[PDB]
């Protein structure tokens, strides 16, 4: 039963609220995360001018143990390139084999093979000493 | 009152250890 921490974003919601109409259309290095779960780092400037910062956690970006979802409702997902439907760097903690952290040998390297083969993802890294799976997506 | 459970537990423990002595009972097939 992995502990689900609190959501967070960078820049903070306060910082984004303080941005003018120009700046909020091109928030650089926008990141949404949840402690002891993972994070989504968008790899381009994003347009947050039509996104409620008070209804972002759990509504648009859902971070659960071993699970990252952006725009969970397919019907209300913006076109590719608009909103948060852009390339991103996702990191998921606790992404070890279901057998547990104490899995080595062929079973562990088999797991890394399976991570690389997950469709619509580009494998970045997996570290057994932390259990963090990092990978890139082009859209959601 | 019910010592049969200890007997079951011991019996199955013995099956395990017995299967361990023989080693993995693996029967694979060859082409010919």
């Amino acid at each position: 039963g992995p502990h689900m921490g609190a959501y967070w974003m960078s820049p903070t919601a306060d910082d984004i609220r303080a941005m003018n109409r120009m700046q909020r259309q091109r928030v650089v290095g926008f990141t949404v995360g949840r402690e002891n779960v993972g994070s989504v780092q968008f790899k381009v400037p994003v347009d947050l001018s039509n996104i409620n910062l008070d209804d972002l956690f759990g509504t648009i970006v859902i971070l659960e143990p071993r699970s990252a979802t952006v725009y969970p409702n397919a019907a209300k997902k913006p076109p590719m390139g608009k909103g948060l439907n852009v390339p991103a760097l996702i990191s998921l903690e606790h992404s070890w084999p279901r057998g547990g952290p104490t899995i080595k040998g062929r079973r562990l390297e088999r797991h890394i093979e399976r991570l690389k083969s997950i469709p619509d993802t580009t494998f970045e890294s997996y570290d057994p000493e932390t259990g963090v799976w990092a990978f890139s997506v082009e859209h959601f | 009152l019910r010592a049969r459970e200890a007997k079951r537990k011991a019996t199955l423990r013995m099956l395990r250890e017995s299967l361990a002595r023989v080693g993995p009972n693996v029967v694979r097939l060859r082409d010919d």
């Binding site: 039963g1 992995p2 502990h3 859902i62 659960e64 143990p65 071993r66 699970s67 990252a68 979802t69 952006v70 725009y71 969970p72 409702n73 397919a74 019907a75 997902k77 996702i90 998921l92 606790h94 992404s95 084999p97 279901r98 057998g99 547990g100 062929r106 079973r107 088999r110 797991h111 399976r114 991570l115 083969s117 997950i118 993802t121 799976w133 990978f135 997506v137 959601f140 | 019910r2 007997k7 079951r8 011991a10 019996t11 199955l12 013995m14 099956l15 395990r16 017995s18 299967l19 361990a20 002595r21 023989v22 993995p24 009972n25 693996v26 029967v27 694979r28 097939l29 060859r30 082409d31």
Partner: protein
């Protein structure tokens, strides 16, 4: 006289041959009730009685099929080739699966097989989860009827993305087909801490996210134990992932359920005994006492409950109906991944990767007082595991419980690997093959393995009987001596009954039939021809 693998009354130009004559996944395209069989061929189901079709070819002189006795066509509303047919317990409902969709066929009166029948022939088909089991969502992997479902009308479906859905069907209420009574996301449950957390599924959650469980909890198959099982077995859903892992859910019940007369009293004794052992033992951990507590709480909902009495849909007799206990919770703990003790080392990828699971439930204290979990790999490897510890009812803790730092880590659940053997030669192994288990009609401890390469018969008798006798042994001594001989015994027997040569055509999952008139035989089929191999005639 071409060498065929079926009797003359199932080969062309016999009328019985019409049942058979005209993509990765399982092919359970044959189902049966008595001597009747249902054969999926594309988007239609071919219905026929083997008894009449036999007689027609024996008493021969020298298009819905209404002109042919003992043969009828069943057109279906499916939009893709049928993959699986699953007969219900009382054999009145038939589950019809494509890769993604599920239809329930209300099986028609058998009188429609006679030529004399002039009345209109339009078997009712019900769509199951129109917005749930769809091509735009996760594929359906297993459909199994709940052993304890009222009127045998409770169905469990499982998808690749490990969502378990219980449907409690009533033809008098369309809504029962539209939505499930219970929906469990195993991926949420696996990582949950408390029994009251959210394990449900959102109708709005249509866009897939990203997770290692996309492969690690990709479901290959699920089953309930063979019925006539005792203890917790008939409330235990077993699952096998393509990753090689095995899971169990217990107790999984629909909102309402029907136990055989002996189930509840046997469980009560089992629960009472477990509470006693937990309390009497001073070395009992607070985690061990909680399981006993939760089970006692579950049972208390049943003791203080008066069972309702309702008719049998296909019957002439009333039976007790209970409601599911609400405490400790509706969703049991997900148990697993099970550790395979004495597992073979250096298993290959196609040996670890699972494609089917078949569980023979413990029998009340005729057979073995232990669950037997059988696992089928892509390679056709079969693994026979024994549930030494005994899977039982478990739930996650309540939020009332305070986490203790000096508490030991929960050791993973375990199965004992008793035996592992190939059923295919290396040359017969296909990289994406989907071999299937099938139950034997005459004994739960025998079963079949079907694969495009061929069909194999397997039996765990008399070995399971020898183990049970030792478990019930009246002898003061000699246990370790006698067990050693049993472990040295070859155990299960296996024999190939059929081999397909130079034909990559997949075979319909073997269907065992034991009729007093037609005899005892296996039924399978190629894309075009039948396979009926007999073992005992009258």
């Amino acid at each position: 006289k071409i060498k065929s693998f079926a009797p003359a009354w199932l080969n062309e130009p016999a009328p019985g041959h019409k049942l058979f004559a005209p993509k990765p996944g399982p092919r359970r395209t044959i189902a049966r009730r008595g001597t009747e069989i249902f054969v999926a061929c594309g988007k239609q189901i071919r219905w026929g009685d083997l008894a009449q079709l036999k007689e027609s070819w024996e008493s021969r002189p020298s298009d819905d099929g209404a002109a042919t006795a003992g043969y009828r066509i069943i057109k279906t509303p499916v939009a893709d080739d049928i993959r699986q047919l699953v007969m219900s317990p009382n054999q009145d409902f038939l589950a019809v699966l494509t890769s993604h969709t599920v239809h329930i066929c209300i099986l028609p009166d058998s009188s429609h097989l006679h030529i004399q029948d002039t009345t209109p022939f339009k078997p009712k088909f019900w769509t199951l989860g129109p917005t749930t089991h769809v091509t735009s969502r996760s594929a359906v992997v297993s459909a199994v009827w709940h052993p304890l479902g009222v009127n045998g009308h409770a169905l469990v479906t499982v998808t690749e993305d490990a969502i378990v859905r219980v449907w409690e069907l009533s033809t008098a209420d369309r809504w029962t087909f539209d939505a499930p009574t219970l929906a469990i996301d195993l991926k949420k449950l696996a990582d949950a801490t408390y029994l009251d957390q959210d394990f449900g599924v959102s109708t709005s959650a249509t866009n897939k996210g990203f997770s290692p469980d996309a492969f690690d909890m990709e479901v290959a198959a699920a089953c309930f134990p063979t019925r006539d099982s005792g203890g917790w077995a008939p409330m235990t859903l077993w699952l096998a992932m393509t990753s090689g892992d095995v899971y169990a859910l217990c107790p999984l019940l629909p909102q309402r359920w029907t136990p055989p007369p002996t189930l509840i009293p046997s469980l009560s004794a089992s629960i009472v005994a477990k509470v006693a052992a937990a309390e009497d033992n001073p070395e009992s951990t607070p985690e061990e006492r909680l399981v006993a507590q939760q089970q006692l709480e579950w049972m208390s909902e049943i003791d203080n409950q008066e069972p309702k009495l309702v008719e049998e849909a296909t019957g002439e007799a009333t039976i007790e109906v209970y409601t599911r206990p609400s405490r400790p919770g509706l969703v049991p703990k997900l148990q697993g991944p099970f550790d395979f003790d004495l597992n073979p080392e250096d298993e290959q990828d196609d040996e670890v990767e699972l494609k089917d699971i078949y569980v023979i439930g413990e029998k009340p204290r005729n057979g073995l007082s232990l669950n037997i979990i059988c696992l089928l790999s892509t390679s056709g490897q079969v693994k026979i595991c024994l549930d030494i510890d005994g899977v039982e009812a478990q739930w996650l803790p309540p939020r009332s419980k305070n986490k203790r730092l000096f508490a030991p880590p929960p050791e993973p659940p375990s199965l004992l690997t008793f035996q592992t053997f190939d059923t295919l030669k290396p040359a017969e192994v296909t990289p994406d093959g989907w071999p299937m288990f099938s139950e034997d009609a005459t004994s739960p401890y025998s079963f079949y393995v079907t694969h495009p390469a061929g069909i194999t018969y397997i039996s765990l008798t008399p070995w399971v009987f020898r183990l049970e006798s030792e478990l019930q042994s009246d002898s003061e001594a000699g246990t370790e001596f006698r067990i050693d001989l049993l472990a040295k015994g070859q155990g299960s027997e296996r024999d190939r009954i059929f081999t397909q040569t130079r034909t990559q055509s997949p075979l319909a999952a073997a269907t065992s039939i034991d009729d007093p008139d037609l005899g005892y035989f296996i039924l399978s089929a190629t894309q075009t021809d039948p396979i009926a191999l007999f073992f005992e005639t009258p």
